[PDB]
Design an enzyme around this catalytic site. Sequence first.
Site, PDB file in Angstrom:
ATOM      1  N   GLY A 114      21.514  42.975 -21.269  1.00 41.36           N
ATOM      2  CA  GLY A 114      21.510  41.803 -20.084  1.00 41.36           C
ATOM      3  C   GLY A 114      22.807  41.097 -20.390  1.00 41.36           C
TER       4      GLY A 114
ATOM      5  N   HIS B  53      27.984  35.870 -29.416  1.00 47.37           N
ATOM      6  CA  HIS B  53      26.798  36.611 -30.292  1.00 47.37           C
ATOM      7  C   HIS B  53      27.744  37.403 -31.266  1.00 47.37           C
ATOM      8  CE1 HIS B  53      23.777  35.666 -27.346  1.00 47.37           C
ATOM      9  NE2 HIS B  53      24.210  36.987 -26.571  1.00 47.37           N
TER      10      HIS B  53
ATOM     11  N   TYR C  37      29.611  39.761 -26.619  1.00 51.03           N
ATOM     12  CA  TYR C  37      29.575  40.628 -27.695  1.00 51.03           C
ATOM     13  C   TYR C  37      31.082  41.111 -28.267  1.00 51.03           C
ATOM     14  CZ  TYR C  37      24.874  41.115 -26.583  1.00 51.03           C
ATOM     15  OH  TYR C  37      23.403  40.973 -26.221  1.00 51.03           O
TER      16      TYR C  37
HETATM   17  C1  LIG Z   1      12.139  41.334 -25.412  1.00 51.83           C
HETATM   18  C2  LIG Z   1      13.604  41.312 -24.927  1.00 51.83           C
HETATM   19  C3  LIG Z   1      14.585  41.156 -25.740  1.00 51.83           C
HETATM   20  C4  LIG Z   1      16.007  41.226 -25.235  1.00 51.83           C
HETATM   21  N1  LIG Z   1      16.859  40.974 -25.984  1.00 51.83           N
HETATM   22  C5  LIG Z   1      18.268  41.089 -25.635  1.00 51.83           C
HETATM   23  C6  LIG Z   1      19.410  41.043 -26.767  1.00 51.83           C
HETATM   24  O1  LIG Z   1      19.352  40.834 -27.803  1.00 51.83           O
HETATM   25  N2  LIG Z   1      20.527  41.027 -25.887  1.00 51.83           N
HETATM   26  C7  LIG Z   1      20.653  41.462 -24.659  1.00 51.83           C
HETATM   27  O2  LIG Z   1      22.031  41.630 -24.104  1.00 51.83           O
HETATM   28  N3  LIG Z   1      19.715  41.760 -23.797  1.00 51.83           N
HETATM   29  C8  LIG Z   1      18.475  41.437 -24.066  1.00 51.83           C
HETATM   30  N4  LIG Z   1      17.549  41.564 -23.371  1.00 51.83           N
HETATM   31  C9  LIG Z   1      17.779  41.903 -21.951  1.00 51.83           C
HETATM   32  C10 LIG Z   1      17.442  43.329 -21.718  1.00 51.83           C
HETATM   33  O3  LIG Z   1      18.454  44.073 -22.727  1.00 51.83           O
HETATM   34  C11 LIG Z   1      17.686  43.961 -20.315  1.00 51.83           C
HETATM   35  O4  LIG Z   1      16.657  43.420 -19.281  1.00 51.83           O
HETATM   36  C12 LIG Z   1      17.712  45.577 -20.103  1.00 51.83           C
HETATM   37  O5  LIG Z   1      19.026  46.068 -20.685  1.00 51.83           O
HETATM   38  C13 LIG Z   1      17.829  45.549 -18.531  1.00 51.83           C
HETATM   39  O6  LIG Z   1      17.771  47.194 -18.386  1.00 51.83           O
HETATM   40  P1  LIG Z   1      16.884  47.800 -17.415  1.00 51.83           P
HETATM   41  O7  LIG Z   1      16.742  49.244 -17.459  1.00 51.83           O
HETATM   42  O8  LIG Z   1      15.371  47.356 -17.778  1.00 51.83           O
HETATM   43  O9  LIG Z   1      17.135  47.140 -16.069  1.00 51.83           O
HETATM   44  P2  LIG Z   1      16.575  46.600 -14.654  1.00 51.83           P
HETATM   45  O10 LIG Z   1      16.793  45.237 -14.521  1.00 51.83           O
HETATM   46  O11 LIG Z   1      15.129  47.273 -14.322  1.00 51.83           O
HETATM   47  O12 LIG Z   1      17.576  47.648 -13.651  1.00 51.83           O
HETATM   48  C14 LIG Z   1      18.842  46.895 -13.265  1.00 51.83           C
HETATM   49  C15 LIG Z   1      19.089  47.056 -11.926  1.00 51.83           C
HETATM   50  O13 LIG Z   1      19.410  48.578 -11.735  1.00 51.83           O
HETATM   51  C16 LIG Z   1      18.844  48.916 -10.501  1.00 51.83           C
HETATM   52  N5  LIG Z   1      18.599  50.167 -10.473  1.00 51.83           N
HETATM   53  C17 LIG Z   1      17.420  51.110 -11.232  1.00 51.83           C
HETATM   54  N6  LIG Z   1      17.599  52.221 -10.974  1.00 51.83           N
HETATM   55  C18 LIG Z   1      18.727  52.560 -10.334  1.00 51.83           C
HETATM   56  C19 LIG Z   1      19.341  53.561  -9.840  1.00 51.83           C
HETATM   57  N7  LIG Z   1      19.089  54.630 -10.077  1.00 51.83           N
HETATM   58  N8  LIG Z   1      20.586  53.504  -9.146  1.00 51.83           N
HETATM   59  C20 LIG Z   1      21.003  52.108  -8.872  1.00 51.83           C
HETATM   60  N9  LIG Z   1      20.517  51.104  -9.213  1.00 51.83           N
HETATM   61  C21 LIG Z   1      19.415  51.362 -10.009  1.00 51.83           C
HETATM   62  C22 LIG Z   1      17.421  48.155 -10.533  1.00 51.83           C
HETATM   63  O14 LIG Z   1      16.706  48.031  -9.351  1.00 51.83           O
HETATM   64  C23 LIG Z   1      18.153  46.765 -10.803  1.00 51.83           C
HETATM   65  O15 LIG Z   1      18.630  46.082  -9.772  1.00 51.83           O
HETATM   66  C24 LIG Z   1      16.252  41.602 -23.890  1.00 51.83           C
HETATM   67  C25 LIG Z   1      14.944  41.676 -22.944  1.00 51.83           C
HETATM   68  C26 LIG Z   1      13.922  41.640 -23.542  1.00 51.83           C
HETATM   69  C27 LIG Z   1      12.630  41.839 -22.822  1.00 51.83           C
HETATM   70  N1  LIG Z   2      19.755  37.246 -27.129  1.00 48.69           N
HETATM   71  C1  LIG Z   2      18.238  37.391 -26.612  1.00 48.69           C
HETATM   72  O1  LIG Z   2      17.107  37.279 -27.471  1.00 48.69           O
HETATM   73  C2  LIG Z   2      18.094  37.543 -25.146  1.00 48.69           C
HETATM   74  C3  LIG Z   2      16.918  37.807 -24.840  1.00 48.69           C
HETATM   75  C4  LIG Z   2      16.454  38.051 -23.404  1.00 48.69           C
HETATM   76  C5  LIG Z   2      17.328  37.810 -22.502  1.00 48.69           C
HETATM   77  N2  LIG Z   2      18.842  37.423 -22.837  1.00 48.69           N
HETATM   78  C6  LIG Z   2      19.845  37.286 -21.840  1.00 48.69           C
HETATM   79  O2  LIG Z   2      19.303  37.914 -20.798  1.00 48.69           O
HETATM   80  C7  LIG Z   2      20.622  37.771 -19.986  1.00 48.69           C
HETATM   81  C8  LIG Z   2      20.375  38.874 -18.868  1.00 48.69           C
HETATM   82  O3  LIG Z   2      20.312  38.247 -17.529  1.00 48.69           O
HETATM   83  P1  LIG Z   2      18.662  37.746 -17.169  1.00 48.69           P
HETATM   84  O4  LIG Z   2      17.793  38.888 -17.550  1.00 48.69           O
HETATM   85  O5  LIG Z   2      18.596  36.495 -17.913  1.00 48.69           O
HETATM   86  O6  LIG Z   2      18.815  37.643 -15.477  1.00 48.69           O
HETATM   87  P2  LIG Z   2      18.331  36.680 -14.576  1.00 48.69           P
HETATM   88  O7  LIG Z   2      16.805  36.992 -14.553  1.00 48.69           O
HETATM   89  O8  LIG Z   2      18.523  35.260 -15.073  1.00 48.69           O
HETATM   90  O9  LIG Z   2      18.822  37.046 -13.045  1.00 48.69           O
HETATM   91  C9  LIG Z   2      19.212  36.105 -12.349  1.00 48.69           C
HETATM   92  C10 LIG Z   2      19.131  36.474 -10.870  1.00 48.69           C
HETATM   93  O10 LIG Z   2      17.866  36.809 -10.426  1.00 48.69           O
HETATM   94  C11 LIG Z   2      17.443  35.733  -9.465  1.00 48.69           C
HETATM   95  N3  LIG Z   2      16.034  35.322  -9.497  1.00 48.69           N
HETATM   96  C12 LIG Z   2      15.024  35.020  -8.569  1.00 48.69           C
HETATM   97  N4  LIG Z   2      13.778  34.745  -8.934  1.00 48.69           N
HETATM   98  C13 LIG Z   2      13.972  34.761 -10.192  1.00 48.69           C
HETATM   99  C14 LIG Z   2      13.131  34.538 -11.307  1.00 48.69           C
HETATM  100  N5  LIG Z   2      11.858  34.071 -11.117  1.00 48.69           N
HETATM  101  N6  LIG Z   2      13.724  34.820 -12.707  1.00 48.69           N
HETATM  102  C15 LIG Z   2      14.995  35.124 -12.799  1.00 48.69           C
HETATM  103  N7  LIG Z   2      15.817  35.152 -12.018  1.00 48.69           N
HETATM  104  C16 LIG Z   2      15.395  35.164 -10.704  1.00 48.69           C
HETATM  105  C17 LIG Z   2      18.376  34.460  -9.601  1.00 48.69           C
HETATM  106  O11 LIG Z   2      18.310  33.725  -8.477  1.00 48.69           O
HETATM  107  C18 LIG Z   2      19.623  35.402  -9.758  1.00 48.69           C
HETATM  108  O12 LIG Z   2      20.213  35.947  -8.679  1.00 48.69           O
HETATM  109  C19 LIG Z   2      21.726  37.590 -20.706  1.00 48.69           C
HETATM  110  O13 LIG Z   2      22.464  36.259 -20.568  1.00 48.69           O
HETATM  111  C20 LIG Z   2      21.201  37.794 -22.069  1.00 48.69           C
HETATM  112  O14 LIG Z   2      21.856  37.010 -23.108  1.00 48.69           O
HETATM  113  C21 LIG Z   2      19.071  37.325 -24.161  1.00 48.69           C
END
Ligand SMILES: Cc1cc2nc3c(=O)[nH]c(=O)nc-3n(C[C@H](O)[C@H](O)[C@H](O)COP(=O)(O)OP(=O)(O)OC[C@H]3O[C@@H](n4cnc5c(N)ncnc54)[C@H](O)[C@@H]3O)c2cc1C
Ligand SMILES: NC(=O)c1ccc[n+]([C@@H]2O[C@H](COP(=O)([O-])OP(=O)(O)OC[C@H]3O[C@@H](n4cnc5c(N)ncnc54)[C@H](O)[C@@H]3O)[C@@H](O)[C@H]2O)c1
Lengths: 278, 271
Positions: A154, A166, A160
Site C-alpha cells: 500500500g 519505514h 521504503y
Molecule cells: C493486515 C494488513 C497488513 C498490511 N501491512 C502492510 C505493510 O506492512 N506495508 C504496506 O505497504 N502495506 C501493507 N498493507 C496494505 C496491503 O499491502 C495492500 O492492500 C495490498 O498490497 C494491495 O494489493 P491488492 O492486490 O489487494 O489490491 P486491490 O486494492 O484489490 O487492487 C488495487 C487496484 O487494482 C485494481 N485491479 C485489480 N485487478 C486489475 C486488473 N486486472 N487490471 C487493472 N487494475 C486491476 C483494483 O480494482 C484496485 O483498483 C497491509 C494490509 C493488510 C490487510
Molecule cells: N505499516 C502497516 O502496518 C500498514 C498496515 C496497513 C496499511 N498501511 C498503509 O496503507 C496505505 C495504503 O493505502 P490505503 O490502503 O490506506 O488506502 P485508502 O483506503 O486510504 O485509499 C484512499 C482512497 O479511497 C477513498 N475511500 C472512499 N471511501 C473510503 C473508505 N471507507 N476507506 C478508505 N478509503 C476510502 C478515499 O476517498 C481515497 O480516494 C499506506 O499508507 C500504508 O502505509 C500500513
Amino acid sequence: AAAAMVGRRALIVLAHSERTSFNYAMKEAAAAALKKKGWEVVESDLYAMNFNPIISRKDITGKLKDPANFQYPAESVLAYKEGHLSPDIVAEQKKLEAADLVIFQFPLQWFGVPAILKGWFERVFIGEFAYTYAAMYDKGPFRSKKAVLSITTGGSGSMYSLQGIHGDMNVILWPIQSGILHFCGFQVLEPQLTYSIGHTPADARIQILEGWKKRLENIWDETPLYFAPSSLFDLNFQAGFLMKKEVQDEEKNKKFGLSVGHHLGKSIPTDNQIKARK
Amino acid sequence: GRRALIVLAHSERTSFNYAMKEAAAAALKKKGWEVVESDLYAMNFNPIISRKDITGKLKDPANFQYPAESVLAYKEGHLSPDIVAEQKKLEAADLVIFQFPLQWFGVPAILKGWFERVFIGEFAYTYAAMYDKGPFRSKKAVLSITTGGSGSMYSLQGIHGDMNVILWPIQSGILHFCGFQVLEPQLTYSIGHTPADARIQILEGWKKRLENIWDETPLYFAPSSLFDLNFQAGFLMKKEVQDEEKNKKFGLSVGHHLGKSIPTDNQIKAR
Ligand SMILES: Cc1cc2nc3c(=O)[nH]c(=O)nc-3n(C[C@H](O)[C@H](O)[C@H](O)COP(=O)(O)OP(=O)(O)OC[C@H]3O[C@@H](n4cnc5c(N)ncnc54)[C@H](O)[C@@H]3O)c2cc1C
Ligand SMILES: NC(=O)c1ccc[n+]([C@@H]2O[C@H](COP(=O)([O-])OP(=O)(O)OC[C@H]3O[C@@H](n4cnc5c(N)ncnc54)[C@H](O)[C@@H]3O)[C@@H](O)[C@H]2O)c1
Ligand SMILES: Cc1cc2nc3c(=O)[nH]c(=O)nc-3n(C[C@H](O)[C@H](O)[C@H](O)COP(=O)(O)OP(=O)(O)OC[C@H]3O[C@@H](n4cnc5c(N)ncnc54)[C@H](O)[C@@H]3O)c2cc1C
Ligand SMILES: NC(=O)c1ccc[n+]([C@@H]2O[C@H](COP(=O)([O-])OP(=O)(O)OC[C@H]3O[C@@H](n4cnc5c(N)ncnc54)[C@H](O)[C@@H]3O)[C@@H](O)[C@H]2O)c1
C-alpha cells in the site's frame, strides 16, 4: 523462434482471498505468459484451497515417537521418512519436488508474508525434505531450483527508501529471502516490487502487468541475488559456525560487508536483496 | 495496580515456552500486577483474515478490501467478537509480553495472524499517528524468544547473520509502528541443548528481570520528527536532518542505516 522451456515446471503460490485483487491479476498474467513459452504451470491458491496454516499433532497421521514430550521438528521428520504425513502436506511437497521455478505472489502484511503463507512454510518445509543441518544455504536440497517474490504494498517506494519513514526494504526482505528460501537451497531472483498499487492509475497497472509478463519470458536466464557462500564458514559446532579466520583477514580492509545479514559492522552493499550483481 | 497481557504461541504445555509464560505470570502477580493471557493455541484462535471478520453489511462486496472494510467495521462496531475481546485486553494492558519460538526467522503463523486481525486501522495505527506518535505510545512491549541455534550462529560473523536484522521487521514494523516502546528482547539461545537445571536458572533470571521491567530504558528508533510526514514529501527524512548526518560514521538504526555502519546491537540493547 523459441523452442525452449518445454521441459520446465513452475509453481505459483498465491496468498490473497479476492479474485478481484491485483494480486490475483498478477497470478493470471504469470500463468498465461509462462504457458505461452511452453512451461507447465501448477498453482497453490491458499485461500481457494482453504489451506490450514497451523502446525499440530494432526499433521502426523501415524504413531508419535514421544506423545508425552511432543516436538514438531523431530516428529515431522520421522513422519516424512516413514510416509505418515497429513496428505494436504504431501500434495504440496510433490508440487515443489516437480517445480523448477517457484513464484510467491502476496501482499506485504505487517512487513512480512501473510499468516496463511507463513503457515504453508511451517507445515510444508519439513526437515530432510527442504533442509538438513549438513546441507544449509547453497548446499541445500533446492539448489537446482529458482524462486522469486512478487509483492504488492500500500505504501509508496519513497517510504521504503534509505531515507523513508519505514526504512530500507532490503532489510525487510532479508529474513524471507535468506532465512527461508536460500536456507533450503533456492537461488533467489530479484523481487518484483509493486509499490502503492491502490493509488496507481489504470493505465499504469496495465503496464505493470505487461512488464511482469515480459520479464517472465527470460526469467530463467537471470542472475540470482548474492548471499555469502557457505564455504566462507566453518560448519561445525566446535567452531561456532563462524566465518573462517582467513576470510575475516581478507575482508578486514574492505569498505562494504558481504550482504544485509553479513554486514560485518560495515556498510551494506546497495540493494543487496533487490538487485543482482554480475 | 498496572495491567499486563501475555501472548503465547506454543501448542505444548510441556514446552519451555509454556514454562516462561507461567514464570512471567507468577512474578508479575507477586509484585501486584493484574495479568491477562492470550494462549493462542489453547484458545483455538483463528489466524486468517476473511470477510467473516465483519459481521455487518460490507460497504462494497463486489470489490472487497480488508483494510477499508475492517476500519468501517471497527468504527460501527460489527467486528467479529473474537477480535473485539483481544482488542479490549490490549486497551487495558500497560505491558505486553510476546512469548514464542523463532520459526523460520520470524513469528509463528498463529501470532502473525493475531497481528493481522487485531491490529486494525484506527485502533492500533492511523497515518497521522505512526511510530512514536502512535496510539500505544503509553504502553511497553517485549519479545521473549527461544531458538534451536546457538548465539554464535546469529552473531555478526555467524552463518545465519546478525540477529538485529531479524528482529527489526517485528520490533520496528509491527510494535513501534503502533507506538509501543520496545524493551530489550529476552533471547534464549539453543534451548534444545540446555539441561533442566540450567532452564530453571533461566526461568529464575527472567522472573528477576520482570520485577523492575517497567523502569528499563527502551530501544532506539529514529524519531518521527526527523521526517516530513505528508504524501507530497514522500515521508522522507528532512533535508536539514540529512545534512546534519552527512558526516557521521554510524546510521541511526538497523532500518535507517543510511548506507553507513549499523550501531551495535541497536535492536538488542538500549543506550
Ligand atoms: C493486515 C494488513 C497488513 C498490511 N501491512 C502492510 C505493510 O506492512 N506495508 C504496506 O505497504 N502495506 C501493507 N498493507 C496494505 C496491503 O499491502 C495492500 O492492500 C495490498 O498490497 C494491495 O494489493 P491488492 O492486490 O489487494 O489490491 P486491490 O486494492 O484489490 O487492487 C488495487 C487496484 O487494482 C485494481 N485491479 C485489480 N485487478 C486489475 C486488473 N486486472 N487490471 C487493472 N487494475 C486491476 C483494483 O480494482 C484496485 O483498483 C497491509 C494490509 C493488510 C490487510
Ligand atoms: N505499516 C502497516 O502496518 C500498514 C498496515 C496497513 C496499511 N498501511 C498503509 O496503507 C496505505 C495504503 O493505502 P490505503 O490502503 O490506506 O488506502 P485508502 O483506503 O486510504 O485509499 C484512499 C482512497 O479511497 C477513498 N475511500 C472512499 N471511501 C473510503 C473508505 N471507507 N476507506 C478508505 N478509503 C476510502 C478515499 O476517498 C481515497 O480516494 C499506506 O499508507 C500504508 O502505509 C500500513
Ligand atoms: C516450523 C519451524 C521452524 C523453525 N525455524 C527455526 C529458525 O528459523 N531458527 C531457529 O533457531 N529455530 C527454529 N526452529 C526451532 C524452534 O525455535 C525450537 O525448537 C524451539 O525454540 C524449542 O522451544 P520449546 O519451548 O518448544 O522447548 P523444547 O526444547 O522443544 O522442549 C521443552 C523442554 O523443556 C522442558 N521443560 C519444560 N518446563 C520446564 C521446567 N519448568 N523446568 C525444566 N525443564 C522444563 C520440557 O520437559 C522439555 O524437555 C523452528 C521450528 C519449527 C517447528
Ligand atoms: N534454525 C537454526 O538456526 C538452527 C541451526 C542449527 C541447528 N538447529 C537445531 O538446534 C540444534 C543446534 O545445537 P545447539 O546450538 O542447541 O547445541 P550444540 O549441540 O551445538 O551444543 C554444543 C555442545 O558442545 C558443548 N559446547 C557448547 N558451547 C561450547 C563452547 N563454546 N565451547 C565448547 N564446548 C561447547 C555443549 O555442552 C554441547 O554438548 C540442532 O540439533 C537442531 O535441532 C537450529
